[PDB]
Design a protein around this ligand. Structure first.
Ligand SMILES: CC(C)CCC[C@@H](C)[C@H]1CC[C@H]2[C@@H]3CC=C4C[C@@H](O)CC[C@]4(C)[C@H]3CC[C@]12C
Ligand SMILES: *[C@@H]1O[C@H](CO)[C@@H](O)[C@H](O)[C@H]1NC(C)=O
Length: 979
């Protein structure tokens, strides 16, 4: 096998030589007729860009940024399917004034009424248009079940009688009995005003289904658009109506039915239970108003100066009402965000010492809106991108221009700058043709890609200058493509593979960004090989006739020695005209400057000691930063100042410290769930629970007390505990029928039961599914919030009686994602490391250099992670992806340097390092500077998604330049794979 291994190494080097010869022939062919290649490349790129017409956008936050775990998503789906929720819109009217002055209160009442006034035409709804289709209908057997359920609901509501002797309370078997319609038949449900929401699926297009009060029976998807404009619905039509009037919660409830008086002050008995007996409606003054500097005269409360006022608006979360609810929300936020009552607050007492009525608002879809706030590419960001392109263009022009005009090649720089953008366009169009939609992070796709392309440009140009000796310009270009094409191909392949491995990430945003960027880099490399190379050939031919670019414009208006062999021979001649580069070469001045001071410094043992000390202390700082690790979890999804959602949340925290998240807790009996999930197509953890057991109820009330005991739990609203307290004596007999009947009567008769009438359901009177909600204290730190959620899950377990209470909130998914962000990133980085090691082993002459490459990459990753932790960058998905991407960039640079050293000759390892530096220190530095010039304008951005990206990328680029320019050269000089 050893003979086979050495023959395989010989085959590898022979294949590299064959690749070089093929590129030699390709360069000859390009030199044959550059203009045809130029026009063909341009038309192909235009055809690729034509896919922009087919471009589609993906902007759902959860798809972009979430693990998409089955657990939380399944929990949310189950809650939606088996329970009814109420969408809550909050409108915190914060101020620096009392807000209880009669004039200010009158103005607030104006605003309150106005909210109700808001109306929306039917045409605004996207689903209401006749163009919108109808989703596949519910199962026919499921529809029959829905009909039977609504029929029996009507019959039972008319009857009003509740008894349990009809039901069978025998403990269910594993099959939930003790396909066919009869299986789901006779499913008596309590409360009678309840049907499983999963079976509530009909044609929401019809006006009658959603709004029966209209009495018109029109179908929005089957009617004229103008008539849809004519038909309108107000807030009421889409608002839950407690007591048959309204379910909205606000201070003005106290003023309803003349009980309260705007001019007069307020005095109520209870903060959270004062009921307006005129209206029979209660209100939680603590929840309604915040930062209340009010007084409390014993039982009565002297509400004097409530500097913050909040209002809660409920909306039907039913799938039928969903588009209408979204529409109104949209109207509402605008109604409030553009609302202003500065006139009344003018010339009023202010604690801040000017009045400021913010009118903060928040809705369910508002988060998505803020996602759009960061999804759209800022106009300022586009301007910054263009300025960075101009900066890198100027830098490339400066590098290309020389003392001798005809020898300089500005056109090469210009066409490289253009070719980067053209390759980006080609990749974007190809991905659009593939059908993958765009992502917000793709805002950084163009700029970065451009810079990457420009890198290759430099290398090619370098080779051209390095072949000044060749008199035949055709032969010069042929050898230029013979030499550096392998390096650029390796760089492109490595970047593509790294970005693919990044695309393996479950995150759709990261995957799409990586796929788009990899395709763009591939197309840019292809364009460079044809477009930029053809322009290079044109300019080389112009230089052959000693034609300046200005002179050429005016006129049109009217020795196979290896370059490494050459540099080795030059250094040997120095030790002991051909090696004298002509005046005005592309990189003669820079290479001479490097060879004068930098190369002797790195060759010097004292310089090596200095470099090693510096990098050792850098590694120590990196270790310290990794130990710090900054913050493991983000705070608010990088919510900027220009975010009514974030401002509202800050206001809520500031003025309502006693109100955090409305965490919900659910119990779902396994049998009923499984059955109803099946119809709409440990085992005994929740297989069947005998709730009539006294010990089980004792455990439940104990769990309630324990949850109340927790410092992070503000309060709870477990109605089951209230029922247990009210009817403990009657529950002495553990009869399931008696338990069900008493619970049903309490739900129907007791006003407390009415308050919790929609938190418990009964299949054959067995309490299959129920829930309770609790207010949890607000906190900015998501880590401690996730820990609190885990503690709540543990407390509500009650595994002793074979019970398990699941917990949910909107932030649970975000907390779970921030839990495994680092883990998935580490796994992806490991896969990336494996792929890069394979590639290097297959593209590097020596395996010692391969392991050196691996060590360099590991060290660079450690350093960049430590320094980004030190600088204050927490765990952000942008940081995680840019980690791998800039690792790919750094290993491209490292491959350049390592190939330069390995293919460099020299009797001394230090001499070999010196030759490698003199041959390749230029292109790497130019590439790094170009990329940093591209990304520099992103120093400040509208969203953190861009500024944090800039910080991470700039830091990693600095580290890559430093290592491949200082650490890697000295390492290869003192311990490199000599011979
Ligand atoms: C001992 C008892 C009588 C004291 C008063 C209990 C209070 C604090 C409880 C009982 C019923 C509860 C309500 C039950 C249901 C909902 C709907 C939800 O979308 C918002 C909270 C809200 C509106 C609860 C607020 C708190 C509440 C009013
Ligand atoms: C309800 O059940 C009771 C027994 O609890 C029994 O009298 C009868 O089945 C029902 N009562 C009616 C219909 O009045």
């Amino acid at each position: 096998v050893k003979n086979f291994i050495h023959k395989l190494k010989e085959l590898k080097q022979k294949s590299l030589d064959k690749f070089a010869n093929l590129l030699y022939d390709y360069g000859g062919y390009v030199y044959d007729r550059p203009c045809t290649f130029i026009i063909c490349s341009l038309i192909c790129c235009l055809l690729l860009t034509c896919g922009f017409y087919f471009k589609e956008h993906e902007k759902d936050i959860y798809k972009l940024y979430s693990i998409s775990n089955s657990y939380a998503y399944e929990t949310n789906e189950t809650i939606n399917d088996f329970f009814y929720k109420s969408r809550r819109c909050f409108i915190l009217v914060e101020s620096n004034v009392n807000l209880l002055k009669p004039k200010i209160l009158r103005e607030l009442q104006k605003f309150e009424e106005g909210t109700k006034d808001i109306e929306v035409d039917l045409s605004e709804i996207n689903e209401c248009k006749t163009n919108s289709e109808l989703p596949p209908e519910q199962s026919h057997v499921a529809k029959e079940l829905y009909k039977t359920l609504i029929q029996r609901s009507e019959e039972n509501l008319k009857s009003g009688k509740i008894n349990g002797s009809l039901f069978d309370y025998s403990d269910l078997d594993e099959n939930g009995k003790s396909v066919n319609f009869t299986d789901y038949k006779d499913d008596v449900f309590y409360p009678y005003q309840y049907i499983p929401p999963m079976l509530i699926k009909a044609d929401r297009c019809k006006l009658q289904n959603v709004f029966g009060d209209k009495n018109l029976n029109i179908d929005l998807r089957e009617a004229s658009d103008g008539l849809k404009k004519q038909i309108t619905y107000t807030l009421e039509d889409i608002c839950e109506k407690k007591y048959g009037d309204c379910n909205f919660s606000s201070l003005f409830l106290y003023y309803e039915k003349g009980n309260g008086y705007i001019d007069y002050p307020i005095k109520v008995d209870n903060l959270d239970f004062y009921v307006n007996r005129r209206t029979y409606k209660e209100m939680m003054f603590k929840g309604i108003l915040g930062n209340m500097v009010y007084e409390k005269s014993g039982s009565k409360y002297i509400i004097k100066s409530a500097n913050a006022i909040m209002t809660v608006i409920p909306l039907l979360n039913s799938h039928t009402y969903e588009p209408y609810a979204l529409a109104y929300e949209k109207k509402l936020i605008d109604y409030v965000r553009f609302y202003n009552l500065d006139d009344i607050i003018q010339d009023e007492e202010t604690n801040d010492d000017d009045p400021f009525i913010r009118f903060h608002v928040f809705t369910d879809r508002s988060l998505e809106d803020e996602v759009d706030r960061i999804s759209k590419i800022d106009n300022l960001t586009r301007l910054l991108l263009l300025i960075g392109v101009l900066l890198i263009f100027m830098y490339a022009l400066f590098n290309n221009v020389t003392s001798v005009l005809y020898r300089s090649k500005p056109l090469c720089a210009v066409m490289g700058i253009f070719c980067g953008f053209l390759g980006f366009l080609s990749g974007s169009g190809f991905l659009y043709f593939l059908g993958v939609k765009s992502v917000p992070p793709a805002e950084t796709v163009p700029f970065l890609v451009i810079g990457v392309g420009v890198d290759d440009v430099f290398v090619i140009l370098n080779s051209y200058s390095l072949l000044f000796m060749v008199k035949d310009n055709k032969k010069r270009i042929q050898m230029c493509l013979k030499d550096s094409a392998l390096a650029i191909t390796v760089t492109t392949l490595t970047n593509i593979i790294a970005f693919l491995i990044s695309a393996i990430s479950p995150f759709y945003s990261i995957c799409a960004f990586s796929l788009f960027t990899a395709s763009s880099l591939f197309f840019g490399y292809l364009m460079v090989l044809t477009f930029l190379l053809s322009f290079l050939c044109i300019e080389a031919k112009l230089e052959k006739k000693k034609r300046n670019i200005f002179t050429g414009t005016f006129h049109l208006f009217r020795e196979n020695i290896s370059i490494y062999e050459w540099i080795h021979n030059l250094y040997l001649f120095e030790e002991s005209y051909i090696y004298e580069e002509p005046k005005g070469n592309i990189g003669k001045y820079f290479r001479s400057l490097v060879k004068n001071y930098y190369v002797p410094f790195l060759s010097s043992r004292f310089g090596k000691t200095i470099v090693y000390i510096m990098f050792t202390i850098i590694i120590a700082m990196s270790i310290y930063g990794c130990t710090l690790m900054k913050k493991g979890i983000k705070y608010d999804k990088a919510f900027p100042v220009d975010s009514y959602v974030r401002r509202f949340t800050t206001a809520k925290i500031k003025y309502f410290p006693d109100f955090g998240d409305f965490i919900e807790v659910y119990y779902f009996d396994k049998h009923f769930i499984n059955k109803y999930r099946g119809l709409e197509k440990s085992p005994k953890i929740n297989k069947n629970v005998h709730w009539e057991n006294t010990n089980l109820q004792e455990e439940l009330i104990n769990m309630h007390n324990t949850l109340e005991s927790q410092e992070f739990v503000t309060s709870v609203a477990n109605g089951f505990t209230f029922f247990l307290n009210k009817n403990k004596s009657s529950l002495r007999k553990e009869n399931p029928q008696e338990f069900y009947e008493i619970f049903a009567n309490w739900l129907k008769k007791d006003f407390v039961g009415n308050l919790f009438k929609n938190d418990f359901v009964f299949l054959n009177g067995k309490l299959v599914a129920w829930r309770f909600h609790y207010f949890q204290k607000n906190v900015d730190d998501s880590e401690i919030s996730s820990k609190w959620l885990k503690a709540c899950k543990q407390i509500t377990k009650l595994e002793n009686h074979n019970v398990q209470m699941v917990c949910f909130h909107l932030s649970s998914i975000f907390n779970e994602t921030d839990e495994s962000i680092i883990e998935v990133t580490l796994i992806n980085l490991g896969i990336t490391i494996l792929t890069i090691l394979v590639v290097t082993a297959y593209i590097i002459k020596g395996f010692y250099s391969c392991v050196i490459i691996a060590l360099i990459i590991f060290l660079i990753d450690l350093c960049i992670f430590g320094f980004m932790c030190l600088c204050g960058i927490t765990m952000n998905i942008i940081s995680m992806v840019i980690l791998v991407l800039s690792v790919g960039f750094s290993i491209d640079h490292t491959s350049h340097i390592v190939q330069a050293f390995s293919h460099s000759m020299g009797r001394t390892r230090d001499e070999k390092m010196k030759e490698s530096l003199h041959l390749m220190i230029g292109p790497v530095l130019h590439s790094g500077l170009s990329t940093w010039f591209v990304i520099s304008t992103l120093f400040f951005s509208n969203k953190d998604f861009t500024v944090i990206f800039f910080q991470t990328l700039s830091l990693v680029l600095f580290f890559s330049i430093t290592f491949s320019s200082m650490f890697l050269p000295v390492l290869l000089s003192s311990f490199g794979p000599l011979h």
